[PDB]
Amino acid sequence: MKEYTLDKAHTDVCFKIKHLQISNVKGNFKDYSAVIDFDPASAEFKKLDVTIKIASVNTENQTRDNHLQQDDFFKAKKYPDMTFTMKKYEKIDNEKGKMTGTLTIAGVSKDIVLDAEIGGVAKGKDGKEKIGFSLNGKIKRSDFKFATSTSTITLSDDINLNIEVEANEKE
Amino acid sequence: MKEYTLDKAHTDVCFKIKHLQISNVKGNFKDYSAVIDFDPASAEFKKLDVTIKIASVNTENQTRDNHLQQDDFFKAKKYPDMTFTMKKYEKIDNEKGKMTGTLTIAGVSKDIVLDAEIGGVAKGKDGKEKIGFSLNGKIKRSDFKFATSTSTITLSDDINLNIEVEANEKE
Amino acid sequence: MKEYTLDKAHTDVCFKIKHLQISNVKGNFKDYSAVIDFDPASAEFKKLDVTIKIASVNTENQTRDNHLQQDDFFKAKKYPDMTFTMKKYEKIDNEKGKMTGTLTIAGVSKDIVLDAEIGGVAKGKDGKEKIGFSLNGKIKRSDFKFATSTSTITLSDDINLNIEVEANEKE
Amino acid sequence: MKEYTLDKAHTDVCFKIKHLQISNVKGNFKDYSAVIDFDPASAEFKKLDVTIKIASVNTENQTRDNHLQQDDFFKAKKYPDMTFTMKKYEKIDNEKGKMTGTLTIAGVSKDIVLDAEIGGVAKGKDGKEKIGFSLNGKIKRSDFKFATSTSTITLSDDINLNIEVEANEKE
C-alpha cells in the first residue's frame, strides 16, 4: 500500500442537519378606510366600520405579499377587501371595553371580540378634538376557512390583530 | 356622540402570525487528525482512522458552537473528541466503494457505512503522490443517543456527513 | 442467467414516511380547593382564591401525569401546588365580566385575565343558594418560565384554561 | 355578599395545550408486477423491471389511500402506475450489491440506488429454483416533484423504500 498525510487546507470534515425554527410574520395594510363614532362624555364607541384593501398588504417582503393575494390565501381578485363592522361596545371603564363586530375575510363572516383600550381623549392644538386608542384580539384562520390548504402546523391557526389609531374630529 | 376621521400617518392596522421554517445547520471541524493507508494499484483503502476535536466545531455562529459543547449535546469536557475507525473497505470499482467503520460520539460507538468516492489519484508536481476522495453518509442521532433531550421534531434525527479529502504521500 | 416470477404471497413493496401531527393535550386536576365570595344582587365576585394540588393532574394517561411532576415541568416535590388569587373583578353585565388575578406556577407569579361567564344564579331545591359559572382564559408558558427546556415548537406556548364551577352557599 | 363552597362533582379545572407528534406512515402496494433476471453462479441481477399500480396503495386506512390518488399526491387518473427499471447492478459480494435504476412517479423520472441484499439462493422443494432478496433505499419527494403543495415540514422529504422479495424460476 501507501501512506498519506492530510492537507488540511483543502480538506473539510462537514455535516448537515435539518432543524425547525418558529417565527412571527408581522404585517400591516397600507390602504384602508374607517368610520369612527365616539362619545368622549361616556367614553363609548357608537359605530366602528372598517374596510381594508387586501391588495395593500405589507409584510416587508414583496414576493410574500403577492403570494398573499393568490387562491391559497386571500383571493384578492374575487375578494378585494376585508371588512369590520361594530355590532356592540360593552364598556368596562373609561379606558377599557369589549368591542364585538363582524369581520369578513374572503367573503366569510364571523363575529369577533376586540379589546378596546382608549389611549387618550384630548382636545388638540387647534381647538378641535383628537383620540388615541387600540383594538387587540385573536382570530382563528379555521373560523374563516382561511388558507385551508396550509396546515395549522406550518402556519399558526391563530392570528393576532393589533390596530393602533390616532383620529381627529370631522369637518 | 362625535365623528372622527383617521390620521393614517399615526394609525397601523397590524397582524402577527406564527409559522415554522425548516433549515439546514451546516458546519465543519477546524481541528482533527487522520491516518490514511491507500493502495493506488488496486484503489483500496487499507486503514482509515480519524479523530476530531469536538472543541473545534464551527457552524458559523459562535454562540451555537459553545452551546454544542454543553451536556445536552457534545459533553466536550467529559468527551473531548470524536473518532472514526475503518473496519472494512468493500470495493465497488476504481472510483467507488463502501467503507464500514466505528464512529464514537460522546463515548457511544456504532458501526457506520460511508460512501467512498475516489476523486483522482495523481502523482503531484514534485514527483510525490497525491489523492482526492470523498466520504459521504447519513447517521442517526438516536443510534448514538445524541442530543436525547432535543426532540426529533425540533432537530432532525438524521445527520449528513460529507468529508472532502486532499492528501499527500508520507515523509 | 435465469428468470424468476414473484411469489406475491411472500413479497412486500413497502415505504415509510415521517409526518407531523398536531393534537390537544387536555387534562384536569382531581384535587384543588377554593374560596368563593359572590354577590347575587350585583352579580359581582368579591373574592376568588384557588389552590390546586399539582400531584392530582389527570391527562388520561398515567405515564405522562408522572412525567408532569418532574423538573422539566412542574417540580411538584419543590412546588406541590399552584394558586390563583383574584385581585379585581370588572363587571361587563350580569352574565359577563373580566376577572384579574395572580397565578403562581412553580413559584413564579403573573397576573392573568379570565373571562367570567355567569351561567345561572339559582336558589336551589332546599331553599339554599347555588351558582354556576365559567372562567376562561389563555396563559403563556413563557410568562411563567414553564417547561423552558421544551421548545415552543414541540409544545405550544399557549395554554387554554377552562374552569367550570357549580357552587353552593356556606354552612 | 355571600359565600359558596364548590361542589367538586360538577366542577372541572381544565386545560388544553397543543403539541406536535412525529410518526411514520407505513404502506405497501397490493398490485404490481416484475421481471426478474438473476444469475446464481455469479450472484448478479441482469434485469429488474417493476410496475406498481398506484391504485393498489394500502396504508391501513382507506380514507388516506383514496386521498393519495388525488392531484396533491399521485394523480392516479393521469398517471395510474409507477415504474422501476434497473440500469446497472454493481456487485459488492455474494450477499450485497448496489442497484442503480430509473424510477418514475407521476411521469417524473429519476435514477436511484437501492441496496440489494441477497437473502438466500436455494433450489426449492420440487427441484426448481427459488431466491429471497431485499432492495432498500431512500428517495427524496423533491427529486420527483412529489406532493409539492405539502411542505417538507408536515411530511418528510425522505421516503424509505423497503422491497422484500421471494421469487421462483420460470415455466
XYZ file of C-alpha atoms in Angstrom:
684
model
C 0.000 0.000 0.000
C 0.998 3.664 0.693
C 0.647 6.296 3.408
C -0.792 9.775 3.156
C -0.988 12.836 5.358
C -3.986 15.168 5.049
C -3.576 18.596 3.517
C -5.837 20.467 5.980
C -6.056 23.469 3.566
C -8.128 21.503 1.004
C -9.859 19.062 3.446
C -13.289 19.584 5.028
C -14.942 17.492 7.719
C -18.582 18.647 7.270
C -22.106 17.878 8.480
C -25.689 18.979 7.641
C -28.631 18.767 9.961
C -32.177 19.925 9.491
C -33.935 21.879 12.237
C -37.249 23.765 12.632
C -37.475 27.437 13.649
C -40.711 29.180 14.736
C -41.069 32.905 13.784
C -43.722 35.669 13.693
C -44.834 37.044 10.387
C -45.798 40.633 11.140
C -47.514 42.938 8.634
C -49.855 45.874 8.188
C -52.092 47.200 5.440
C -51.160 50.484 3.680
C -54.741 51.138 2.393
C -57.963 51.019 4.448
C -60.732 53.383 5.491
C -62.882 53.694 8.579
C -65.883 55.413 10.117
C -65.416 56.323 13.791
C -68.318 57.367 16.084
C -67.209 58.044 19.641
C -68.686 59.877 22.659
C -65.990 61.420 24.909
C -68.540 62.182 27.697
C -69.253 58.477 28.269
C -66.139 57.045 26.544
C -68.213 54.676 24.372
C -67.865 53.805 20.695
C -71.196 54.143 18.829
C -70.121 52.983 15.358
C -66.892 51.466 14.060
C -66.765 50.367 10.451
C -63.502 49.432 8.721
C -62.573 48.320 5.183
C -59.150 47.159 4.288
C -57.841 46.777 0.753
C -56.259 43.302 0.699
C -54.031 44.415 -2.195
C -52.263 46.853 0.182
C -50.818 44.168 2.487
C -47.193 44.771 3.551
C -45.216 42.112 5.315
C -41.830 43.726 4.442
C -41.021 41.288 1.570
C -42.655 41.865 -1.784
C -42.672 38.250 -3.051
C -44.785 37.050 0.003
C -47.312 39.943 -0.259
C -48.025 38.933 -3.929
C -48.300 35.328 -2.821
C -50.909 36.515 -0.259
C -53.320 37.645 -2.972
C -53.348 34.110 -4.627
C -56.110 31.391 -4.206
C -54.424 29.555 -1.338
C -54.735 32.766 0.810
C -56.677 35.984 0.087
C -58.227 35.515 -3.441
C -57.879 39.312 -3.897
C -59.170 39.138 -7.488
C -62.584 37.726 -6.291
C -62.483 39.345 -2.798
C -60.557 42.661 -2.967
C -61.293 43.853 0.542
C -61.809 42.752 4.137
C -64.327 44.448 6.406
C -65.000 45.053 10.067
C -68.382 46.182 11.377
C -69.032 47.002 15.054
C -72.243 45.428 16.399
C -71.731 46.127 20.163
C -69.452 48.038 22.508
C -69.533 46.864 26.091
C -67.870 49.416 28.387
C -65.508 48.235 31.136
C -64.368 51.616 32.390
C -63.176 54.853 30.692
C -60.021 53.197 29.420
C -61.256 49.782 28.532
C -64.062 47.961 26.826
C -65.015 44.898 24.859
C -65.906 45.530 21.166
C -67.956 42.916 19.294
C -68.203 43.120 15.468
C -68.421 41.257 12.172
C -65.244 40.517 10.330
C -65.332 39.287 6.760
C -62.307 37.799 5.082
C -62.664 36.434 1.535
C -66.448 36.553 1.844
C -66.626 34.613 5.046
C -68.029 36.360 8.058
C -67.653 35.786 11.755
C -68.324 37.926 14.830
C -65.179 38.760 16.803
C -64.277 40.432 20.165
C -61.626 43.084 20.274
C -60.169 44.627 23.340
C -60.565 48.371 23.183
C -58.027 50.322 25.089
C -58.586 54.104 24.978
C -55.185 55.769 24.981
C -56.157 59.428 25.499
C -59.092 61.658 24.600
C -57.668 65.125 24.012
C -58.818 68.443 22.545
C -55.935 69.046 20.067
C -53.678 72.062 19.225
C -56.280 73.872 17.042
C -59.274 73.631 19.476
C -60.635 70.579 17.584
C -60.823 67.059 19.116
C -58.432 64.103 18.854
C -58.442 60.463 20.210
C -55.918 57.657 20.504
C -56.994 54.029 21.021
C -56.039 50.465 20.339
C -58.048 47.387 19.337
C -56.478 43.998 20.128
C -57.695 40.468 19.615
C -57.032 36.970 18.324
C -58.911 35.279 15.434
C -58.681 31.691 14.231
C -57.856 31.053 10.493
C -60.121 27.991 10.804
C -63.135 30.137 11.740
C -62.866 31.915 8.377
C -61.749 28.870 6.401
C -58.585 30.894 5.625
C -55.532 29.388 3.930
C -57.310 25.916 4.308
C -54.608 24.141 2.199
C -51.777 25.324 4.572
C -51.735 23.139 7.754
C -52.127 24.560 11.231
C -48.633 23.092 11.728
C -46.696 25.151 9.126
C -48.650 28.326 9.865
C -50.418 29.017 13.157
C -54.216 28.820 13.309
C -54.047 31.964 15.490
C -53.811 35.478 14.097
C -53.149 38.410 16.440
C -54.673 41.679 15.480
C -53.226 44.880 16.747
C -54.924 48.121 15.492
C -53.350 51.362 16.662
C -55.463 54.508 15.980
C -54.966 58.307 16.120
C -58.098 60.136 14.897
C -59.400 63.720 14.551
C -62.929 65.149 14.744
C -64.861 65.695 11.457
C -65.180 68.719 9.041
C -71.674 61.448 20.164
C -68.920 62.716 17.775
C -67.286 61.772 14.480
C -63.632 61.206 13.730
C -61.504 60.685 10.654
C -58.365 58.540 10.900
C -54.950 60.141 10.702
C -53.312 57.450 8.522
C -49.807 58.769 9.449
C -50.121 57.598 13.090
C -52.511 54.620 12.511
C -51.439 50.997 11.995
C -53.619 48.050 11.038
C -51.286 45.176 12.078
C -51.228 41.389 12.434
C -48.842 38.713 13.815
C -48.812 35.098 12.811
C -46.500 32.316 13.840
C -45.036 29.976 11.227
C -42.412 27.183 11.144
C -39.362 27.224 8.850
C -37.105 24.194 8.206
C -33.358 24.925 7.625
C -30.008 23.078 7.401
C -27.403 23.667 10.032
C -24.110 23.139 8.226
C -20.725 23.028 9.978
C -17.210 21.635 9.893
C -14.463 20.981 12.410
C -11.273 23.117 12.306
C -9.150 20.545 14.252
C -8.866 16.802 13.526
C -6.187 14.320 12.524
C -6.176 11.196 10.402
C -4.155 8.190 9.308
C -4.620 7.281 5.633
C -3.467 3.937 4.131
C -4.310 3.610 0.453
C -3.127 1.391 -2.431
C -3.295 3.171 -5.824
C -2.660 -0.108 -7.746
C -5.932 -1.642 -6.517
C -7.675 1.593 -5.411
C -8.469 0.190 -1.943
C -8.227 1.837 1.467
C -6.288 -0.332 3.963
C -6.600 1.831 7.089
C -8.587 4.981 7.826
C -8.500 6.362 11.338
C -9.843 9.820 12.199
C -10.045 11.889 15.408
C -11.899 15.113 15.594
C -11.569 17.651 18.387
C -15.170 18.470 19.355
C -13.989 21.839 20.707
C -13.098 22.897 17.128
C -16.676 22.778 15.787
C -17.617 25.704 13.510
C -21.174 26.286 12.460
C -20.535 29.963 11.513
C -22.092 31.417 14.723
C -20.022 31.416 17.880
C -22.865 31.267 20.441
C -24.211 27.921 18.951
C -20.733 26.279 18.782
C -20.280 26.947 22.570
C -23.766 25.607 23.162
C -22.661 22.442 21.281
C -20.045 21.582 23.901
C -22.695 21.595 26.767
C -24.383 18.462 28.359
C -27.450 18.484 26.115
C -25.135 17.908 23.061
C -21.409 17.036 22.977
C -20.248 16.992 26.681
C -16.814 18.168 25.427
C -15.453 18.435 28.986
C -16.001 14.636 29.581
C -15.659 13.600 25.887
C -13.246 15.988 24.094
C -13.025 14.119 20.819
C -14.957 12.003 18.330
C -13.335 9.129 16.466
C -13.707 7.150 13.278
C -12.023 3.788 12.736
C -12.215 1.862 9.439
C -13.019 -1.844 9.910
C -13.715 -2.786 6.229
C -13.450 -1.351 2.734
C -15.582 -3.086 0.151
C -14.531 -2.069 -3.372
C -17.189 -1.278 -5.987
C -14.907 -0.160 -8.788
C -11.861 2.176 -9.007
C -13.957 5.224 -8.214
C -16.352 3.867 -5.684
C -16.566 1.717 -2.613
C -18.402 1.112 0.616
C -16.414 1.923 3.813
C -17.527 0.377 7.115
C -16.086 1.743 10.401
C -16.671 2.551 14.060
C -17.778 6.013 14.965
C -17.751 7.161 18.564
C -19.530 10.288 19.678
C -19.547 11.161 23.394
C -18.332 7.665 24.246
C -21.001 5.861 22.332
C -19.918 3.694 19.464
C -21.691 2.431 16.400
C -20.508 0.965 13.092
C -21.368 3.134 10.087
C -21.193 2.878 6.238
C -19.694 5.685 4.251
C -19.718 6.024 0.538
C -16.188 6.402 -0.722
C -15.834 8.254 -3.936
C -12.231 8.473 -5.200
C -11.821 11.819 -6.927
C -8.392 11.392 -8.556
C -5.181 9.523 -7.781
C -2.345 11.658 -9.120
C 1.447 11.815 -8.848
C 1.835 15.512 -7.849
C 4.080 18.415 -9.042
C 7.204 17.292 -7.095
C 7.189 13.577 -8.169
C 5.470 12.578 -4.884
C 1.902 11.160 -4.717
C -1.428 12.881 -4.031
C -5.106 11.672 -3.720
C -8.516 13.313 -3.613
C -11.586 11.491 -2.256
C -14.874 11.986 -0.518
C -16.685 10.041 2.211
C -20.467 10.522 2.420
C -23.085 9.009 4.667
C -26.034 9.500 6.992
C -26.061 8.685 10.744
C -28.981 8.737 13.163
C -28.663 10.878 16.384
C -30.782 8.175 18.056
C -28.188 5.476 17.309
C -25.643 7.399 19.400
C -28.120 8.658 21.991
C -27.072 12.170 20.862
C -28.872 15.325 21.991
C -31.535 12.957 23.620
C -33.336 15.917 25.322
C -33.907 17.704 21.928
C -36.860 16.061 20.062
C -36.534 14.554 16.614
C -39.115 17.223 15.704
C -37.083 20.383 16.511
C -33.842 18.899 15.191
C -33.676 16.103 12.623
C -32.691 12.601 13.743
C -30.599 12.431 10.540
C -27.093 13.835 10.242
C -25.398 14.003 6.832
C -21.687 13.610 6.803
C -19.668 14.966 3.970
C -15.835 14.532 4.259
C -13.792 16.048 1.453
C -10.089 14.993 1.416
C -6.885 16.060 -0.398
C -3.871 14.075 0.880
C -0.137 13.689 0.126
C 2.208 10.702 0.468
C 4.325 10.401 3.671
C 7.882 11.635 4.623
C -28.603 -16.216 -16.233
C -32.106 -17.332 -15.056
C -35.656 -15.997 -14.862
C -37.913 -15.715 -11.852
C -41.541 -14.889 -11.202
C -42.509 -13.186 -7.934
C -44.411 -15.096 -5.289
C -46.783 -12.255 -4.296
C -47.700 -14.102 -1.034
C -44.208 -13.579 0.468
C -43.303 -10.298 -1.358
C -43.842 -6.784 0.021
C -43.372 -3.489 -1.787
C -43.191 -1.127 1.242
C -42.480 2.503 2.130
C -42.044 4.603 5.317
C -42.542 8.314 5.563
C -42.371 10.589 8.552
C -45.086 13.185 9.142
C -46.038 15.637 11.930
C -49.455 15.670 13.630
C -50.711 18.497 15.895
C -53.005 17.470 18.825
C -54.518 18.942 22.024
C -53.440 17.602 25.355
C -56.471 18.076 27.583
C -56.446 17.491 31.350
C -57.961 18.476 34.673
C -56.910 18.356 38.304
C -58.687 15.932 40.695
C -57.642 17.858 43.875
C -57.997 21.616 44.488
C -59.821 23.923 46.872
C -61.354 27.357 46.530
C -62.905 30.268 48.388
C -65.841 31.870 46.556
C -67.319 35.280 47.531
C -70.153 36.357 45.260
C -72.992 38.914 45.463
C -76.114 37.805 43.530
C -77.736 41.286 43.855
C -74.995 42.927 41.769
C -73.586 39.761 40.121
C -70.003 40.595 41.166
C -67.281 38.343 42.554
C -65.713 39.797 45.734
C -63.048 37.154 46.416
C -61.846 34.164 44.409
C -58.934 32.172 45.750
C -57.949 28.786 44.311
C -55.250 26.209 45.143
C -54.604 23.231 43.002
C -52.567 20.210 44.040
C -50.169 19.636 41.125
C -49.885 15.968 42.145
C -53.571 15.481 41.199
C -53.119 16.238 37.479
C -55.032 13.893 35.138
C -54.412 13.910 31.436
C -55.948 10.416 30.930
C -52.565 8.590 30.675
C -50.713 7.791 33.866
C -47.142 7.791 32.482
C -47.477 11.480 31.254
C -49.021 12.728 34.552
C -45.951 11.342 36.465
C -43.697 12.933 33.880
C -45.509 16.242 34.616
C -44.284 16.319 38.214
C -40.549 16.084 37.104
C -38.027 19.047 36.862
C -38.621 19.772 33.179
C -42.308 20.628 34.014
C -43.975 21.080 37.429
C -41.222 20.326 40.060
C -44.020 19.020 42.343
C -41.521 17.965 45.033
C -40.323 21.632 45.489
C -43.629 23.272 44.387
C -46.574 20.993 45.317
C -49.363 23.386 44.437
C -50.451 26.118 42.038
C -52.515 29.082 43.187
C -54.944 31.632 41.841
C -55.813 34.827 43.703
C -58.426 37.326 42.459
C -57.233 40.952 42.619
C -60.066 42.614 40.587
C -63.436 41.813 39.056
C -64.560 44.211 36.371
C -68.264 43.736 35.598
C -69.458 43.730 31.979
C -73.095 42.888 32.588
C -74.930 40.306 34.765
C -73.618 37.418 32.704
C -70.143 38.554 31.921
C -67.092 40.126 33.444
C -63.336 40.339 33.321
C -61.503 38.748 36.311
C -57.905 39.788 37.028
C -55.806 37.700 39.472
C -52.396 36.316 40.386
C -51.479 32.892 39.174
C -48.437 31.118 40.541
C -46.992 28.060 38.885
C -43.797 26.538 40.314
C -43.205 29.667 42.387
C -43.485 32.072 39.527
C -46.272 34.585 39.639
C -48.035 36.571 36.978
C -51.333 38.468 36.863
C -53.841 36.986 34.416
C -57.295 37.910 32.958
C -60.045 35.358 32.921
C -63.355 35.700 31.238
C -66.113 35.163 33.748
C -69.322 33.894 32.342
C -72.099 33.506 34.943
C -74.184 30.502 33.958
C -77.132 30.831 36.365
C -77.696 32.160 39.874
C -80.405 29.999 41.419
C -81.902 29.375 44.862
C -81.607 25.538 44.968
C -84.004 22.666 45.915
C -83.575 23.065 49.719
C -84.104 26.890 49.913
C -80.308 27.465 49.990
C -78.384 29.219 47.162
C -76.458 27.784 44.203
C -74.379 29.319 41.304
C -72.921 28.076 38.039
C -70.125 29.954 36.238
C -67.151 29.523 33.991
C -63.700 31.134 33.917
C -61.853 31.047 30.576
C -58.509 32.413 29.503
C -55.170 31.842 27.809
C -51.750 31.965 29.549
C -48.292 31.803 28.001
C -45.827 29.094 29.285
C -43.086 31.671 28.618
C -44.623 34.154 31.077
C -44.143 31.614 33.882
C -40.869 30.193 32.582
C -42.734 26.847 32.388
C -41.271 23.761 30.714
C -38.358 26.078 29.489
C -36.366 23.079 28.097
C -39.306 22.008 25.806
C -39.434 24.279 22.687
C -42.462 26.337 21.762
C -42.392 24.181 18.606
C -42.953 20.721 20.181
C -45.425 22.048 22.745
C -47.460 25.225 22.289
C -46.526 28.336 24.274
C -50.289 28.847 24.774
C -52.300 27.138 27.491
C -56.102 27.399 27.490
C -57.768 27.375 30.830
C -61.340 26.336 31.149
C -62.775 26.281 34.741
C -66.352 25.077 35.065
C -67.948 25.703 38.513
C -71.123 24.630 40.372
C -71.140 26.004 43.945
C -73.458 26.101 46.991
C -73.887 28.697 49.750
C -71.982 28.179 53.057
C -72.892 26.405 56.390
C -72.107 39.487 49.526
C -72.355 35.669 50.046
C -70.088 32.647 50.432
C -70.045 29.453 48.424
C -68.351 26.086 48.648
C -67.524 24.197 45.443
C -69.447 21.078 44.527
C -66.451 19.057 43.252
C -68.820 16.583 41.477
C -69.926 19.197 38.896
C -66.710 21.335 38.858
C -63.813 20.921 36.413
C -60.451 22.665 36.488
C -59.325 22.022 32.868
C -56.570 22.948 30.413
C -55.809 22.423 26.684
C -52.399 22.540 25.122
C -51.335 21.888 21.575
C -48.327 19.679 20.852
C -46.685 18.133 17.752
C -46.092 14.387 17.329
C -43.857 12.848 14.621
C -44.951 9.419 13.223
C -44.135 7.030 10.340
C -46.707 6.406 7.684
C -46.004 2.870 6.509
C -47.698 1.261 3.496
C -47.357 -1.268 0.704
C -48.919 -1.819 -2.696
C -51.264 -4.815 -3.223
C -50.850 -4.823 -7.062
C -47.557 -4.718 -9.004
C -45.643 -6.907 -11.429
C -41.971 -7.529 -12.054
C -39.441 -9.152 -14.355
C -36.506 -10.755 -12.523
C -33.279 -11.866 -14.289
C -30.712 -13.293 -11.897
C -27.578 -15.464 -12.233
C -26.984 -17.678 -9.157
C -23.447 -18.641 -10.348
C -22.205 -15.044 -10.063
C -24.984 -13.680 -7.796
C -25.698 -10.742 -10.138
C -29.010 -9.267 -11.258
C -29.186 -8.890 -15.069
C -32.614 -7.250 -15.405
C -35.058 -5.893 -12.836
C -38.184 -4.183 -14.081
C -41.089 -3.321 -11.773
C -44.515 -1.699 -12.277
C -46.730 -0.784 -9.426
C -50.407 0.081 -9.723
C -50.786 3.310 -7.721
C -54.479 2.495 -7.200
C -53.452 -0.513 -5.051
C -51.770 1.535 -2.296
C -52.542 0.350 1.259
C -51.583 2.410 4.247
C -54.070 0.613 6.573
C -56.705 3.423 6.489
C -58.994 3.647 3.496
C -59.703 7.409 3.586
C -55.911 8.267 3.250
C -55.318 5.768 0.382
C -58.127 7.497 -1.649
C -56.621 10.850 -0.764
C -53.305 9.519 -2.180
C -54.735 9.173 -5.685
C -55.791 12.929 -5.786
C -53.863 15.818 -7.557
C -51.889 16.908 -4.498
C -50.205 13.417 -4.427
C -50.322 10.619 -7.035
C -52.686 11.886 -9.842
C -53.670 8.218 -10.415
C -56.240 9.180 -13.073
C -53.475 10.724 -15.321
C -50.612 8.500 -14.018
C -52.005 5.076 -12.987
C -48.702 3.360 -12.340
C -45.167 3.845 -11.048
C -42.207 2.059 -12.601
C -38.732 0.883 -11.728
C -36.165 -0.079 -14.357
C -32.711 -1.472 -13.494
C -29.889 0.182 -15.470
C -26.871 -1.237 -13.522
C -26.045 -3.782 -10.840
C -22.710 -3.271 -9.155
C -21.719 -6.364 -7.156
C -20.228 -5.968 -3.670
C -20.013 -9.626 -2.732
C -22.416 -12.616 -2.993
C -24.787 -11.120 -0.453
C -24.633 -7.485 -1.311
C -24.664 -5.085 -4.199
C -25.630 -1.630 -5.338
C -28.561 -1.483 -7.831
C -28.994 1.637 -9.979
C -32.288 2.155 -11.883
C -34.896 4.595 -13.160
C -37.884 5.296 -11.012
C -40.863 7.152 -12.407
C -43.554 8.571 -10.188
C -46.375 10.584 -11.786
C -44.398 10.834 -15.020
C -41.270 12.173 -13.447
C -38.165 10.079 -13.704
C -35.004 9.931 -11.675
C -32.219 7.360 -11.328
C -31.994 5.839 -7.848
C -29.618 3.498 -5.903
C -31.019 0.592 -3.990
C -29.141 -1.632 -1.659
C -29.518 -5.218 -2.751
C -29.201 -7.752 -0.038
C -29.467 -11.365 -1.263
C -31.193 -13.372 1.446
C -30.702 -16.933 0.150
C -30.414 -18.623 -3.235
C -31.966 -22.064 -2.854
C -33.110 -24.914 -5.101
C -36.677 -25.378 -3.729
C -38.781 -28.424 -2.640
C -39.733 -29.510 -6.208
C -36.195 -29.380 -7.763
C -36.910 -25.905 -9.232
C -35.078 -22.719 -8.103
C -36.066 -20.050 -5.569
C -34.457 -16.737 -4.336
C -35.029 -14.328 -1.472
C -33.679 -10.756 -1.546
C -34.319 -7.256 -0.354
C -33.950 -3.844 -2.007
C -33.586 -0.849 0.334
C -33.095 2.828 -0.327
C -34.147 6.406 0.333
C -35.661 8.789 -2.269
C -36.429 12.487 -1.937
C -40.038 13.693 -2.704
C -38.394 16.881 -4.020
C -36.437 14.951 -6.669
C -39.732 13.790 -8.201
C -41.646 16.998 -7.515
C -43.993 14.806 -5.417
C -46.709 16.244 -3.177
C -45.181 19.767 -3.960
C -48.074 21.582 -2.160
C -47.393 19.682 1.152
C -44.355 21.239 2.955
C -41.261 19.267 3.851
C -42.243 20.223 7.419
C -45.652 18.463 7.639
C -44.466 15.445 5.657
C -40.830 14.373 5.388
C -38.950 14.962 2.131
C -37.449 11.477 2.654
C -39.179 8.267 1.628
C -37.735 4.906 2.695
C -38.256 2.054 0.344
C -38.149 -1.463 1.592
C -38.850 -4.216 -1.034
C -38.890 -7.769 0.278
C -38.885 -10.486 -2.451
C -39.409 -14.278 -2.637
C -39.274 -15.496 -6.264
C -39.388 -18.792 -8.210
C -37.775 -19.830 -11.505
C -39.866 -19.556 -14.728
C -42.194 -22.040 -16.596
